Amino acid sequence: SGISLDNSYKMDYPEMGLCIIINNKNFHKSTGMTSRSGTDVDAANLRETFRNLKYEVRNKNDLTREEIVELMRDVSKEDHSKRSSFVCVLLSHGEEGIIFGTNGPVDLKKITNFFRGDRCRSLTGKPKLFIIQACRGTELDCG
Amino acid sequence: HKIPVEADFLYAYSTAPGYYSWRNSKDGSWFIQSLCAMLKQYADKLEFMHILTRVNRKVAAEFESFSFDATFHAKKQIPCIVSMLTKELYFYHH
């Protein structure tokens, strides 16, 4: 054939891939964290938006820190060979480097490490997108 | 050839390092509202980094907090794109 260019990710696999949405709204009382009013609007918007991009969307609500880690581990052990990409959306309280399960915090590095090139071989060389709506500290931008 | 184990990740953060992030109890969060609108309008036209740049512009321009508490009133937000990608990403093909 003619000259070929390889500057764009291959996105014509049989499936676009998974879109995992973790929507944490209600937190255990002992944590002291408020209910995140409005987050269901976000979760519904994301579901429809990524549906129209042909992602296989899975919505999960109010997961503990243990449930977040097990979900990510299990998803990272699926066979993604027929999938072009992977997307994860996290909606929660947070701090720099941290997102909250309903009962306490999770290091973001623990979640993303499951998808490292050497730990999830069916996503090696494929784009892995993490979309994070959470605080990263307590500074305010005055503008 | 080996690949770095951190290659081919993209982190679309709602806010800059060290900062709060804003969520409206009626309309949803500033970042997710804007992200979905820009994906709806541009996913069949633009590369993903350029879509996220339009999200940055929309969050920075169209939102400002309203609060009875002076500490939290009249504040702004900029999201933060962190890319370890090695190629351009288009959601369409052919």
Binding site: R36, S37, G38 | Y20, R23, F72
Partner: peptide, 4 residues
Amino acid sequence: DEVD
């Protein structure tokens, strides 16, 4: 408007 609330913070996360």
